[model samples]
Target chain A: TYEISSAEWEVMNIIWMKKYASANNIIEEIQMQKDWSPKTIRTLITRLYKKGFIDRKKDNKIFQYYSLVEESDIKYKTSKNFINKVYKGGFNSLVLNFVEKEDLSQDEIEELRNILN
Target chain B: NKTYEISSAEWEVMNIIWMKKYASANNIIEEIQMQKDWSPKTIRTLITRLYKKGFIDRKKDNKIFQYYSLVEESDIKYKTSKNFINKVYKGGFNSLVLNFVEKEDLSQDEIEELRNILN
Candidate 1:
């Protein structure tokens, strides 16, 4: 599995959301949330491509990028890795800690109950 | 404030030290080798890296070196948890919890316990 850095994840999120995005599309979306330079975003795009997380195709003069891996697969792996590292592979403990420590809305609480059901 | 990033392999070594609060290189290697196929030298390198990263401190216990954690486990857990949620769930703690709940199977007792906590 490829390890995506936080910045790389930002770029991947854009492509995952849009299915396919040009560099301009990613730059605009990421800039709204981060104060990163275009060059930095391009650098991250190149890194993601190099990591095989994304594939690109030339469209006219611009390249369009799409995810080579599933977003859920990445999410699952990252979550599992976090659980292992922080909770010592204790999935139940991780969930319990989050429930006990984090603030949750009433709707979210109800949603939790529904899921447990 | 500065934060130290512990790599995945490093965490294996850190966990052993954190559990005992202090451990020798030989002690760590003995424990880790059972779980990992890494050679003693590889585990020693991880210990050395942790020492250089300031995550652990070494003291001479007789002729052997004993390594103890300089950082608290809770502090690392909190920071890593915050970063994980932000990076993976876009800072939605509730979503992170909910996603795990939906994906992982819970025992009936565990589900009941969570339900009680929610109530």
Candidate 2:
């Protein structure tokens, strides 16, 4: 079970998007987007490393980090768990609710049709 | 802003509380103990958290406390699901569906069903 909490997902998202990052670079980038302190981001980094969600290599004094899990895997695990726990049900209901709430535009619906095909 | 969060353990009891409309420690314990061996303390602690977080309303009924959800299950589901989408998909529903399709082993029937629904 790859259980990444909401906050941990924040730290992982930066690394996942960039493909590879260091604590310094991650700290620097995330600061602009969120009000989180450096310690908070660093704690998330350490936790992610300990949980083996990320791989770290010592680049001189700083550690460079990369995600060990695929984005699709993370999304799948969390979505399945969310459906099970929150909905007390299956994926179909989630998809149903998501579409209902999302209220896709004509173009988006066409896009969905193309994808479903 | 959503401040309160129901942990996995909290969720275990909350579901039952929602189902019962009003629940007691005895009621929650009986339901949960059927599935897992949780101490009365653990169950009580969840009730306490639920009350403190404003997830549930409580009243003392003689020697026992009665608990009921202050919040709707639908609201909790919507908030958690929204948070999930924001974090994982960056609020991109299209990407989420596409990525899910790429990763999951959707049946031909499921694919057809989705297409029909879209149409």
Candidate 3:
């Protein structure tokens, strides 16, 4: 599993929602949204690819990036790792805490019920 | 809200103190010593860092320093989860839930258990 830093995580977020994007596209979004520089954003995208967290294709001589990792893959691993680290692998306790803390909306609760069923 | 950060190793130490509610350095070391290759000095350094970061409260108990979390466990969990979802799931918690529900090959029994919790 690739260990993505917070910066890389931000880049991944853009690419994930967009499904595919150019380095310039990602950099622009990040630069506009955060105080990051183009060079820094470029470096993060490169690092993400090198770490095997993302992949790319050539589109009109430009690199368009898509995720190599699945959302579930990272979430499952990250959640498990954090829970183990912070709660000593007590996942039930983790779920209990999250459920209690988050004020679930009726719609969200209904969605959860549907998924569970 | 006051904010602080902890390294992965420091998190292990915090978990022990959080569980015990209050513990001495030796108590934490004894509990985690088998799991980590950390020397006593290393553990002490983690405690010192945690204390300075205000993640752990320090108490002098009969010449022994006792450690406990200054913050709530659920609060930390909530914060970390938000950060995780924001980073990895594109701030779409719905995406996260969809993945867990669709992937993971969760058993019917497990799904039922979660349902019981929610409903």
Candidate 4:
């Protein structure tokens, strides 16, 4: 229920940098990657903070925020969805599919040999 | 045609493999396990899936089969970009770029970078 969606991950990436972040700081950070104004940033902060992926610590006049979710959680959730989307229950089936579809460069091919051994 | 999609975790592994390549099950399991809470078995499952999707190439020598990515990450990026544009911008590539530029800080270098790509 608290998993960050794809769009939300963009915001989370900025938070992941240092952990605790202020709303204004987050807005400034996000405003870089988005056209979002202060208002939109505040709204997103409220929505995400409410969702428990983050926490707001009231510090005097300003609220201090910290991330409750780790980057791996988002990775896991996204991977699970990826597996479920195509292979449904059979995640292994796509291995050959990727192998057949992907083009391995010479450097990559060399690395594959070493990693396998 | 069914589009190939990547999950975040898988993307991590794929990027590793795509960049580094030819990883054995143990090699893959070790790196992926560190970045994830998934057990070796679960990581193996992801590997196996990538293999089946023709994304992997396993070179078998005796008992060991080293895996390699047949798919190119750049190709996947281009493909994914299209899909993402379709979903969020309703197939508006211009809108997607516009929205992205609006959200993120665009340095002069980046503007030129984008222009180079578009050109």
Query: Against the true two-chain complex, what DockQ does each candidate achieve?
Result: 0.45, 0.50, 0.61, 0.03
Instruction: Tell me the TM-score of each prediction against the true structure.
Output: 0.82, 0.79, 0.86, 0.45
Per-residue lDDT of model 4, residues B1-119, tens digit only: 88565665566567557757677877877776665678888788788877776787888854898888888665565455444434334324333333333444345654553323322
Q: What order do candidates take by TM-score, descending?
A: 3, 1, 2, 4
Best by DockQ: 3
Rank list by lDDT: 1, 2, 3, 4
Writing each residue's lDDT as its tens digit, candidate 3 over A18-101 gives 999998988778886688888888999999889988888998699999998776677666666666776653555555666788
Q: Which model is ahead, 3 or 4, in terms of TM-score?
A: 3
Model 4: residues >4 Å from true position, as ranges? A1-117, B1-6, B61-63, B116-119
Error of 4 at A99 (Å): 25
Q: On DockQ, who's better, 1 or 2?
A: 2
**Model 3 residue-pair collision total:** 0
Model 3 C-alpha RMSD to native:
2.5
Q: How well does chain B match by TM-score in each candidate?
A: 0.88, 0.75, 0.87, 0.74
Q: Candidate 2 — which residues are off by over 4 angstroms?
A: A1-3, A57-63, A99-110, B59-65, B108-119
Cand. 2 TM to true fold:
0.79
Question: TM-score (chain B) for model 3?
Answer: 0.87
Candidates in order have lDDT scores of: 0.80, 0.79, 0.77, 0.59
